[PDB]
Structure 1
Amino acid sequence: EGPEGANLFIYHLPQEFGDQDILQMFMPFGNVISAKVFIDKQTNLSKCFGFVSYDNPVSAQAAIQAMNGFQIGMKRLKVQLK
């Protein structure tokens, strides 16, 4: 985890997405220093939301503007500054 408002919560993820998936999807907006999908630790199933950290707040802002409302797997992502 890093800087500022450089941290994002992403909701309505495809349940099949893992850490690497979310990392690669958000790297186009800048240097991602950590990315995590949250899972139910009994079933190991994704909770369909996760966390992404950039090394700068402008990347996070760009990611929000581009990926909030973005449709993938018949859902629209909800991308939110933490």
Structure 2
Amino acid sequence: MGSSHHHHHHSSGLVPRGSHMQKEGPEGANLFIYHLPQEFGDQDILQMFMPFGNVISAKVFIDKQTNLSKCFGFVSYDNPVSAQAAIQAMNGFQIGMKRLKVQLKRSKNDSKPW
């Protein structure tokens, strides 16, 4: 087809939306955190993980039945190098009567022995 007008930018700035929502980086750049106390939150686990690299997204899990924290969360990086560093940086971290567990997100690349 022929050329056409670009109709200009949608907002001349950041895209408007009802939420910032979650998003992920490349493979191996995603991270998990568990054993968190209830004082954690999406911004709190974010500030805990931002010095390890550029975090694209961060969230602490919540129960829709009680609105209490599920004591674990999810985080993601723009590269796997900052992700694997953040595992060795927060895994085994003592808080309260427990130590924080940290791990990579599940993937179909690991769902098989091949």
Q: TM-score interval w.r.t. the shorter chain?
A: over 0.9
Q: Which is richer in strand?
A: 1
Match of 1:61 in 2: 84
Aligned residue runs from structure 1 range 1-80, under 5 A? 1-80=24-103
Distance between the aligned counterparts of 1:73 and 1:7, measured in 2? 26
Unaligned runs of 5+ in 2: 1-23, 105-114
Show the counterpart of 2:111.
none
Q: Which runs of 4+ in 1 moved over 2 A?
A: 72-75
Tell me if structure 2 keeps the 8 A contact 1:10–1:78.
yes
Normalised to the residue count of structure 2, the TM-score between the two structures is 0.68
What's the offset of the Cα at 1:3?
1.4
Alpha-carbon deviations, 1:15-49, whole Å to 9, x = none? 12110000000111000000011110121111011
Whether the 8 Å contact between 1:14 and 1:75 is mirrored in structure 2 is: no
Bigger relative CO (Cα 8 Å, ≥ 6 apart):
1
TM-score, normalised to structure 1's length? 0.93
CA deviations 1:44-80 (Å, max 9, x no partner) are: 1110111000100000000001110011233211000
Cα separation, 1, equivalents of 2:61 and 2:26: 21
- Residue 61 of structure 1 aligns to a residue whose secondary structure is helix
The RMSD of aligned alpha carbons is: 0.9
Of all paired residues, the percent bearing the same amino acid is 100
Looking at secondary structure, tell me which structure has more helix per residue.
1
